[PDB]
Structures are given as structure tokens and as C-alpha cells.
Design a protein around this ligand. Structure first.
Ligand SMILES: O=C(O)c1ccc(-c2nn(C(=O)c3c(Cl)cccc3C(F)(F)F)c3ccccc23)cc1
Ligand SMILES: CC(C)CCC[C@@H](C)[C@H]1CC[C@H]2[C@@H]3CC=C4C[C@@H](O)CC[C@]4(C)[C@H]3CC[C@]12C
Length: 241
């Protein structure tokens, strides 16, 4: 079997081992929806408590994407500067894509702390426009009905992007990117799913939504800082303190 069919398998394996929540569990749990009383309970929480909860869930989700990245062929062989550049730009873009698996377009709910709730769950954060943007992005992805393997290959390409400003070894990233692009294109062809290519977000869209999200996270972190045990300290230090 070709270098490319092995690359498809290695990316899908890495994804399955780092996917954090099982799609089968997320789909089954769709009927499990926060009550009016449970929603009011969350809305009455202080923004500092809701921040602690959301910051920790987002940090944990990022750490799953760091593991994913570390398991991609060639990622660990990049200079550390380039590993940091790709993960700083890319890891939260991958979390925002991964969210569509935990999103129900039927009732516009996301899986959060054991049940499905709407964006009004997060009212205490005072972030309505940003959170509405994140829900809308997930709503856009949900219409693709991404397979686990499509999500794996697409999110590998979200990360392995030679056009990120700051790369020291651009040609090493291009070589990895070309192989992952071929793997993705090969797999869509093999599975009669080339139709999703025309429906993928414009790439400026994910970058710009991600930029707004992280900017807001950095403001909360400045006001009420959380600490975690860094999975990748050089990267952690490029964002935390
Ligand atoms: O475990 C780690 O090594 C690690 C763990 C997390 C990151 C990482 N956090 N992050 C955030 O936006 C973030 C989050 Cl998710 C929660 C609270 C505060 C923040 C903020 F201060 F950075 F704004 C990112 C964005 C983009 C890329 C990587 C990361 C990086 C490294
Ligand atoms: C401070 C503000 C910006 C926080 C944003 C609030 C909402 C949008 C956040 C808080 C917790 C987040 C979730 C935390 C963990 C996961 C699991 C991951 O596998 C997919 C994304 C998903 C499901 C996140 C989606 C976005 C989320 C629901």
C-alpha cells in the first residue's frame, strides 16, 4: 500500500486516539437537553465561575489537539519554532472545527458538562456576539455531516499550513502539507465525497473567528487567570504566564 494510504490511516488513527469525545456518544446524548431550570442555574452563575469552567474545558480541548499534532507524521521533526507557530495559529482553529461533532443543528445546542444547551447557557460571560459567531460556524460545518475520517484529514490540514507567518523551515511544512492534501483528496475521491470540497469554510473565515475567540480568551485570562500543567510548555508560555 502507498505512502499516501498509510498517511490516511496514520492521521485517522491519531484522530481516533485524541478525538476526546466519541461521535457515537455525542449523537446518543442529543435528547439529553438542559431543562429551563438548569439553563437559569448557569445564567445566574457569576462571569468568573463560567469563565473558570469554560477556560478549563477549552484548555483541555487544546491539549487533545496538541497530542493529535504530535502524532502527525513529520510534525515532531519540524524545528520547535515551527511546531509553536503551527499550534499557536492552528490548535484553536481545530477546537472550533471539532465542536461541530458536539453540535445539534436541529435545536442549535452544544454538548456542555453532560447535556446539550443553547448559546443562552453562556449569558453570564457577556460574550453573546462571539458565542453566536461560534454557534453559527458549527451550524455551517454541521450541514457537511463530516465523517470521523474527513474531520481527521481536514483538521490535520488546518494545522499543517506553510502560509502561517513566522515559519523558519517553510519548505519542510510544504512537504508535509502536500502529502496531507493528497491524502485528503485521495480519500474523498475513494469515498465519493469530493462534493464537500466546495462547501468547506473560506479559510479566512476560520482564521478570523479564531482570532476573535483567542483575543477574548486572552482578555479573560488577563482579568482572571487560570493555570494548567502545560502539555507543550514552549507553546503554553507563548500564550500564558
Ligand atoms: O497545555 C498546553 O501546553 C497548552 C494549553 C493551552 C494552550 C492554548 N490556550 N489557548 C487559549 O486561547 C486559552 C485557553 Cl484555551 C484557555 C484559557 C486562556 C487562553 C489564552 F490565554 F491563551 F487566551 C490557545 C489558543 C491557541 C493555541 C493554543 C492555546 C496552549 C498550550
Ligand atoms: C470565554 C468564551 C469565549 C467561551 C466560549 C463558550 C463556548 C462556546 C465554549 C465553552 C466550552 C467549549 C467546549 C469545550 C470542549 C469541547 C470538546 C471538543 O472536543 C470540541 C469543542 C468543545 C465542545 C467546546 C466548544 C465551545 C465551548 C462550548
Amino acid at each position: 500500500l502507498t505512502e499516501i494510504e498509510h498517511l490516511v490511516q496514520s492521521v485517522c488513527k491519531s484522530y481516533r486516539e485524541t478525538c476526546q469525545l466519541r461521535l457515537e456518544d455525542l449523537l446518543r446524548q442529543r435528547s439529553n437537553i438542559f431543562s429551563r431550570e438548569e439553563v437559569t442555574g448557569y445564567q445566574r452563575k457569576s462571569m468568573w465561575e463560567m469563565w473558570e469552567r469554560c477556560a478549563h474545558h477549552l484548555t483541555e480541548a487544546i491539549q487533545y489537539v496538541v497530542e493529535f499534532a504530535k502524532r502527525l507524521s513529520g510534525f515532531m521533526e519540524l524545528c520547535q519554532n515551527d511546531q509553536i507557530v503551527l499550534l499557536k495559529a492552528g490548535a484553536m482553529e481545530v477546537v472550533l472545527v471539532r465542536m461541530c461533532r458536539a453540535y445539534n443543528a436541529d435545536n442549535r445546542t452544544v454538548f456542555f458538562e453532560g447535556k446539550y444547551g443553547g448559546m443562552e447557557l453562556f449569558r453570564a460571560l457577556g460574550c453573546s456576539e462571539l458565542i453566536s459567531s461560534i454557534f453559527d460556524f458549527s451550524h455551517s460545518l454541521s450541514a457537511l455531516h463530516f465523517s470521523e475520517d474527513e474531520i481527521a484529514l481536514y483538521t490535520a490540514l488546518v494545522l499543517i499550513n506553510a502560509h502561517r507567518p513566522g515559519l523558519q523551515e517553510k519548505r519542510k511544512v510544504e512537504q508535509l502539507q502536500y502529502n496531507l492534501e493528497l491524502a485528503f483528496h485521495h480519500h474523498l475521491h475513494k469515498t465519493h465525497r469530493q462534493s464537500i470540497l466546495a462547501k468547506l469554510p473560506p479559510k479566512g473565515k476560520l482564521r478570523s473567528l479564531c482570532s476573535q475567540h483567542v483575543e477574548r480568551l486572552q482578555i479573560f485570562q488577563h482579568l482572571h487567570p487560570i493555570v494548567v500543567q502545560a502539555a507543550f510548555p514552549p507553546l503554553y508560555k507563548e500564550l500564558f504566564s
